């Protein structure tokens, strides 16, 4: 009953390095960019 | 000052010593030979049936790995815009028996596999294989299948080994045993590095004092080899042509800017 | 030895371009494009012609362009006469492999291919179950080239992810003519204490030169210094390192570069099956 | 799986020297000399033929 | 339209059960279609 | 091979060279270093991933020559050298 | 890791980078035109960059 | 067509868009940081090394 009742846009993938992008930038795969 | 000295001419390969240039240019040459100088190779294959022990993709890739004769006297291999001329290398076989590269039918007697003894795929009973691979001109930079061959070069250096170094005779003997030019005098021995010369650890303690290495400015030893697609001399020729054409194109772009 | 799982990569140890830092690993483009480290993924879907107790049945037929659960469009473009694909027909997205048709209590429920999967059909068997119901098993293969993000690891717990695929042209070469297949950052060695990997590199070099396969059995394998002392008489610096030239500019680096042949294994952690997004 | 047609690092023809390699070693002739008698310069290209497995002689006997 | 374990094809349809009426075998194989198949050789 | 002008200044030119790689870029730079009037001549590829691959050149002179002329000079040097080398080359196989 | 090793090599007592190296690689950063690059501290052994 | 002002487009990710990068386990706050999308091919997230 009652005393037993009240009781009881994203993505994910591998990461790769990139010292050629800005420190605040993030590399996002364009396929992921086409879904999000 | 430009000068060559062909050391050896082998079956579709060559070893030589370029002198009077420098690092930059020699790299332009080599990189161009690898990634620019075009050949013929299978781009795509249209399979009609494949009951062989391999997948369509594997076989197709292997077909792309087969060196195809590239006639330099028929096509502009120095062109920046290559011809989209298509060659049809077809085949219809049936097991049992092994399929070689020499079994391939060509739509052009000038464009065939350079080597007919390359194992493709083994066919067993009732295993048919019918396809018409399309071959085009391509560059190594887009896919390594189109690479005409390989080039490796090093600084042409002289190794001075003072006779103050215990057992220098062994170094001399090693050099002669490996085919490196040895010069002897009233002091040390000079070894010409037309190839890598790895000194013994036994002698690594003399690295500096009695033993020292000097680079010959501008002189590099190269080794160029192909697969049968192109004559080995022709590849170098075409590379140089590519250099010239690239620079020319660049100036053409410069004039239309100002 | 009769059924291995990996390849001998001629690995070079240096940080190039700074794309192999933090366990990352750099790969020769050409080598990949020539076969090295390529693999195929396999996944078989099944479809059992269930017979409902009520008397109704499924029957695998091409779902007639009607109503009830119908996907519409040419998602059924690949289906045949019986609503089953034929081999070597490119599969992708929510493509229908077998056209089902379950009655009321008629829906679709046709088995479609997984989301982040594609590729080509290989075998389409067909048979019966113990129930005496027509069973269809269709397997799909997916060509998988070692792309950016895939996981690689040697037999020394030295796991790493492909950080960048650099063209063989930019790839540095040794005076002997050797071009690296996999370049590991030199920062992933002194911190960890894995001498066996370096010794394995030297052993693979000797093995490649001599022709011997070399015995590295625990406790009873050649003491490292012997492979080091043999490697030279084979014609190579004892130190596992050689002279390498910078493929970009051209001057040879003012140091020696430890190059070896270490056996790398491709793990089943392919980025193709890790990436996914939510709308 | 039948000798990686050509090579990986050194990417030149090598499949065409499979049979005679194997058969030459299958008499006692040390591979490290057999290879030398054939077009086997660098070890990178040599490795591809040294450590090969030819699993295909199992797989065909199927479908 | 079929095959089984080490022999030849069969005809289409069905009504009672499915075993190869040429081998007595139970498994059927859909052979690859002999049509055109372009495999992009990379 | 297209030249995308990034920025122009008095005796200064920054631009992208579409369709080019390390080969021609590097060769052109090191060739550009021979002109004593060229104060600066460098390139880098702030994009090593996409298909672009295109580089970024920057050439700065001292006023006694425009960057454009210096570039023409460099490419001309390249052309002449490659031709000479080719002639020796063919004139070797003997 | 490499940032540390690179900072060391770049700021070493014996750190002399020929024009080829300095000029071509400063493009990994920026900042030159006039009174930045100047003026080559060492021309003793050879004209070089500390 | 005549979209007129006031509509709304769901455009693909552009270079520079605000985006949160996250790695579990999320110990300190520094585990979730705002980044600037720089759209690139292949199939991994690129993180600048520092
Ligand atoms: Zn090799």
Curated annotation (Swiss-Prot), chain B:
Known role: DNA-dependent RNA polymerase (RNAP) catalyzes the transcription of DNA into RNA using the four ribonucleoside triphosphates as substrates.
Assembly behavior: Part of the RNA polymerase complex.
Intracellular or extracellular location(s): Cytoplasm
Name recorded for this polypeptide: DNA-directed RNA polymerase subunit Rpo3
UniProt entry keywords in alphabetical sequence: Cytoplasm, DNA-directed RNA polymerase, Nucleotidyltransferase, Transcription, Transferase
Record has Transcription as a keyword: yes
BP GO annotations: DNA-templated transcription
Catalytic activity: RNA(n) + a ribonucleoside 5'-triphosphate = RNA(n+1) + diphosphate
Origin species: Thermococcus kodakarensis (strain ATCC BAA-918 / JCM 12380 / KOD1)
GO cellular component labels: cytoplasm; DNA-directed RNA polymerase complex
Cysteine disulfide partners in this protein: none
Curated annotation (Swiss-Prot), chain D:
Compartment(s): Cytoplasm; Chromosome
InterPro entries according to UniProt: RNA_pol_su_RPB10 (IPR023580), RNA_pol_suN_Zn-BS (IPR020789), RPABC5/Rpb10 (IPR000268)
A biological-process GO annotation: DNA-templated transcription
Cofactor(s) in the UniProt record: Zn(2+)
Residues holding Zn(2+): 7, 10, 44-45
Molecular function via GO: DNA binding; DNA-directed RNA polymerase activity; zinc ion binding
GO cellular component, one term: chromosome
Family: Belongs to the archaeal Rpo10/eukaryotic RPB10 RNA polymerase subunit family.
Biological function: DNA-dependent RNA polymerase (RNAP) catalyzes the transcription of DNA into RNA using the four ribonucleoside triphosphates as substrates.
NCBIfam families membership: PRK04016.1
Protein's name according to its UniProt entry: DNA-directed RNA polymerase subunit Rpo10
Curated annotation (Swiss-Prot), chain E:
One annotated GO biological process: DNA-templated transcription
TM regions (residue ranges): none
KW Acyltransferase (keyword) present: no
Catalyzed reaction equations: RNA(n) + a ribonucleoside 5'-triphosphate = RNA(n+1) + diphosphate
Keywords, alphabetical: Chromosome, Cytoplasm, DNA-directed RNA polymerase, Metal-binding, Nucleotidyltransferase, Transcription, Transferase, Zinc
GO CC annotations, alphabetized: chromosome; cytoplasm; DNA-directed RNA polymerase complex
GO molecular function, a single term: zinc ion binding
Residues the entry annotates as binding Zn(2+): 4, 20, 23
InterPro entries: RNAP_P/RPABC4 (IPR006591), RPABC4/Spt4 (IPR029040), Rpo12 (IPR023464)
Gene3D superfamilies: RNA polymerase ii, chain L
EC nos: 2.7.7.6
Cofactors (names): Zn(2+)
Cofactor note: Binds 1 zinc ion.
Subcellular location: Cytoplasm; Chromosome
Family to which the UniProt record says this protein belongs: Belongs to the archaeal Rpo12/eukaryotic RPC10 RNA polymerase subunit family.
Complexes and interactors: Part of the RNA polymerase complex.
Its biological purpose: DNA-dependent RNA polymerase (RNAP) catalyzes the transcription of DNA into RNA using the four ribonucleoside triphosphates as substrates.
Protein's name in the database: DNA-directed RNA polymerase subunit Rpo12
Swiss-Prot record, chain F:
SUPFAM superfamilies: RBP11-like subunits of RNA polymerase
A molecular function GO annotation: DNA binding
Class in the EC hierarchy, top level: transferase
Gene Ontology CC terms, in alphabetical order: cytoplasm; DNA-directed RNA polymerase complex
GO biological-process terms attached to the record: DNA-templated transcription
Short name of one Pfam family: RNA_pol_L_2
Localization in the cell: Cytoplasm
Annotated keywords: Cytoplasm, DNA-directed RNA polymerase, Nucleotidyltransferase, Transcription, Transferase
The protein's Enzyme Commission number: 2.7.7.6
Main location, first listed in the record: cytoplasm
Reaction catalysed by this enzyme: RNA(n) + a ribonucleoside 5'-triphosphate = RNA(n+1) + diphosphate
HAMAP family per record: RNApol_arch_Rpo11
Assembly behavior: Part of the RNA polymerase complex.
Function statement: DNA-dependent RNA polymerase (RNAP) catalyzes the transcription of DNA into RNA using the four ribonucleoside triphosphates as substrates.
Family: Belongs to the archaeal Rpo11/eukaryotic RPB11/RPC19 RNA polymerase subunit family.
Protein name listed in UniProt: DNA-directed RNA polymerase subunit Rpo11
Organism in which the protein naturally occurs: Thermococcus kodakarensis (strain ATCC BAA-918 / JCM 12380 / KOD1)
